[PDB]
Assembly symmetry: T
Homo-oligomer: 154 residues x 12
């Protein structure tokens, strides 16, 4: 059974995703415990600011193409494919990083869909914007997978 | 009929509030139109970062007092007294600023409750943290009310 | 028009635009003077930077950039008019947005052309420039109480 | 009045002016609040800096600067009034402009006087201050929808 | 006196004080000229910053700050005198310390008043200012070969 | 103990703590060496800054800070031991957190005492210090796989 | 010619000159490319800054600056030619030097005129610009193996 | 060759190139020593940065970068020769340009390959690097008195 | 071996070492990835800087530095191996430490030799490099849970 | 005494000295308070940095630095006394100078010992510290109206 | 004497002065050593910059600056004497002030001469230098407990 | 000659050298003017700093530095000549190089002497200076198309 997504709808979906992600980054940064706390907490603060910057750029690009960004938590929750769960039972640093990596992978793959879609639509600016963001996501995937003792695509 | 709030619960409520507020600041910054766009959009970007900083400080103070911050959009929405609405019908710059001022006023008054509560509980650090934040909120109230051609407490 | 001719055309355009940005910044009056004068100074620097990068990219692909005011005037599609009768801030901003739109649409032609010719570098350069132009269109349209594409 | 007396007069003037700048920055209301409030803080700093330079030039030429509010009040030609009735942004800016023009014209008298007395340093100092005042007059007049000398 | 009246009184006080700091910095002579003139410039900035913060805090609580030299003179408890007879560096520093002590003690009154009124922000603001004043008192008393509270 | 005696006690404590921070930074071994050695250097600077501010605040209230190692040892409640037998990173961090906790609880006594005595400045100073200590306790406890207050 | 007309003429000149500086910077070849290309970029910014200052000074004196390429071409004494046949670095530098000398000499006329009219600010502005031009003439003549006035 | 093999080839190439840049910077003699030695240092940093970015991109796509000098020599198309007989600045720059051209052309192959594979990130990375290479080609050809593609 | 030969040997060594540093930084996995990867980037830069300084000192003493990968490989005592089988973080750090120790000991031979030859500059240069190596050995040995000379 | 024991002795000395520098900085009174208090703060940081470098050098040579106040007191040749009776600025500076001379002379012993043992790094480290000490001796002796070695 | 001869004379003077500033900074002793030694370093930089600017202005006007110590000695009106008998800080400052006054007065002659010759740039240059000299005279006279022109 | 006499001789030398550097920077003409003029300004600052460090080291060892041009002329081995007949850039660089070699060789004598006398600080100071001189010799000889020791 079917459905269609344009550049505007793709961008708006990422506004929702990024907002869930950035809140998740904070969850990880706040609740983490273990020997790697100092470096990883700092790392979460860096990702929080970077993905918040991506979010704002996505929303403002959406604005520039005549779109209307989701701008409430209700709308972000109703639209995001990025999943969130309250922090209840204690999680290992590895478990937290696996959740982080899984979401980075989700965003990478969705951005790839976005890159293809925007190429088809001839939206070169949005296309290049998404490529630049994927570049950074790919680097983070390599690094965080390495933290987990894994290959980037393993 | 009754209910009680301690420092932990007050802080957690503000984590929820600040997250709704910061998203609202972005809504205002994104959707604003009119002669004051450049200065006010920039101003929204500044408030976004400032209130995001307050939020993180509130959550990390909560952590430091043995609390568990809300860390999902679901939890922020379920707990916030700060109200949000999707941007549907066009709003004037004044209307957007009135929504901003109203939320600043809400936070100021809640922070005052928080200041009194934390004073009673003997949590001096949280008390001073909240005072410093109220100081900034009061300054913003004066300025934004002045933008609206109004006295700070009018 | 090839990539070389497109680039050279933008060297001409950007030089007219940059002079127009100064006109607007110099002659503007009204309540938004301080913020918009500063914004004109920013745009002047940015579009002057675009111009030099266009001209130097042209050089790098074996071209010969226009390098006189006579050549810029003879070749530009961006229009200029002396400042005679007083214009409102909105009228000045409408001239600015109109020129931004002209540049955006011409750059889109340049993006297509350079993609056809397989000039990847010029392509990416023009895309980055268009990105900034699009942001400016949204903001300046917003100043005018309008949607970016209205 | 000689150079010493002229400078001392400006010490008095600038102290009234900086206090007026603050009044305008504190009491202003309206849509241009953010940019104009910030602009008042910039002017406050600039004119405070001119003031200190004037007083220190006066010291360097063997003078004795006024250094009390009583002395500033007794000597200044720049006028001040308490903020009672609400003033529009335009009214506050007209008050600012009027004071800028007063200072410009007095500085011109100072420039002439100092040239006649052969005090080349004080002369150049006054010229550089006038330069800034003239720029401010253009910009603030432009904010008011007026020509600089209108 | 309430918080608003206390704040407004300090706006008056700080404006007299900053002018005094300048008097001291301008007229000082002796072996400690270089370091103490620089120190006067630092204090001038600091106390002018406190003044602006007091006035803006007053604004934020629904007050109306004094904004003319006439109002500052009419209301200040900080005393000023024109520089007539030459003063020793020590005498200038004694005048400075005496004023710092006056402000510290009045701020202490303000801290207690604002605590009673439940104006937590103004309270903290005044405490932070007192902190700095206390440090200055120690240092300048030490320059005078005295204990801070001697 | 009064405010003066409490402050002087912290001058002693902070001097022992700062030397302990160096011990930990110097003797630490294990996988977290680079991040934790750097963190010890940061804490050394921060607690050295706290110490000087405590001592200078004491000076400002008419006190006489301890200013010899003999006096610090004679007065500190913070304990020190020479580094003899190898300690794990966790053991070093437990000593650090224990000392942070000691300081937090003592500062809380200081906060109460200084509130009783009406020394508002010292009160706020100690609160700001406690704020930082609390943040450090959370972080270092988190490193140890523990809740801040467990 | 009055001050306004002199200033407006320089707006035109500087716009032609800045475009010429880019011509030289873009088309230059030879062993001194890196140093001289960079030098052209610096001169471009500097003369662009003089131009804006001249135009804004003109505005401040009640003038109306030329603000189109058509106006600059129709009014400039500074000459331009398209780059057709290859020029030596020396030839490009001789064109640069010649234009600097033209501007120096015209500015000298402007200095004298502005002195006659009693426009002290414009006078000082033009002198400061001449100072820079004279320094560039010395250096670029030295590059050419010549004395500054040879 | 796939993206992984192309990237790995460039890791080899860039490591030979950076070493060559150093050779040129170390052994150069003549009148353009100062500017060109500095330029070699800039290129060394830039190309070492490209190398690291290529290797890290390779890592990010599941590759395994060459990470020994043996591997770089075994795989590079960029040629190296020990400095024996003295070379002119021009000859050193010709070797530099020739290598820049080799890299540009291979990057062009990489841009097309990665476009076909749908590796958008690697594609953009290579385009950005080519952009810089093209600018260098123009500039160094200009130093050699040549057109960029001559 | 003389000073020239010793230096040239270190040019070879440092080039193998920097490439090894990158290998370690690229291929590392485990919990210490973030801090150690960053540490590898720092060491890469530092040892690259030592390398350039060694080569340039060699130039300054009339020497001819190795300036090809072939020459570095043929001359280095620092060993390299391709990354094939997965290595633990400890194993990678042991490889790093071993190379640091090799360099330290060779530098010591260099320090002795250069002292005997009376090359005071090269002597001091080597001493300063050893200082840094010794600090690194302590820190990396500490990471490995070992004493510096264990 | 060997290098390790010499270094460890200096760890002790520098810790006593740094505390003494604070004693002087805190208790000083007189006309030179501002300059000298600041100077004490600079010396505090500098000697604290020497101390950490000595301790870390000790670590790098397989040593175990003293890392408790008890150890510093039991091993230091630098003497300390509590501040009881008021001291003149000169008296405080004489205590400072005497301790600098003590450290200079001991460092000279350390330089000779370290030269004998062939510990080139520690040698150079101690020489660089002596250089600074000798500069401070000249300056502080000059403050006291004395020749450096008088 | 013309502008060229006047300028060349100041090249001579400033070179003697700068060397004198160093004499004063090197040989000074007494309580004000730290502040005044630093002040001498500041003056040395400033007057060295004036010197270079004078010499380069001379170059720009077709002159030939003195560029040997022999020429500076043969031409300077500024007097120098070897430091033999110990001088008081006041004596050293009196020599400084005397030379500052000499320079001020000669610059005043230069200002008049250059105005007569219509050398506007040199005129403004000398005025800016005098400005600073006058400020230094006020400050150093104040140090000596004297009025600037006393 | 002892350390004190050697140092004082270099105070003399560096002052002649610095004046020579300015001569070269002022009078130079030719294609390399921009790069080399800037290089002269860099050398002037560097050798002026060496000079001050030499003089202050002399002070620290109980010496009395030459502090007049008469003393520098009477004592310097570095030769100076007025600029009369035009010199080639190469001729000027040959004079620079020759003086750098003179200084290097005398510093080498100073290094030996100071090692004999056991003045470790002066020794290291001179070595650091030689380090830079050697680097300059390599670079300037390379400019002249020569090997460093040729």
């Amino acid at each position: 059974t079917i459905n269609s997504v344009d550049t505007k709808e793709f961008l708006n979906h990422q506004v929702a995703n990024l907002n869930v992600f950035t809140v998740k980054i904070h969850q990880i940064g706040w609740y983490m415990r273990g020997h790697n706390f100092f470096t990883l907490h700092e790392k979460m603060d860096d990702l929080y600011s970077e993905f918040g910057e991506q979010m704002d750029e996505v929303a403002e690009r959406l604005l520039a193409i005549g779109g209307s960004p989701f701008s409430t938590l209700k709308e972000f929750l109703e639209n995001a494919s990025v999943e969130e769960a309250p922090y209840t039972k204690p999680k290992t640093m590895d478990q937290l990083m696996e959740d982080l990596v899984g979401t980075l992978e989700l965003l990478r793959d969705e951005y790839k869909q976005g890159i293809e879609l925007t190429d088809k639509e001839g939206d070169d600016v949005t296309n290049d914007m998404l490529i630049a963001f994927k570049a950074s996501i790919d680097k983070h995937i390599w690094m965080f997978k390495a933290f987990l003792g894994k290959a980037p695509l393993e």
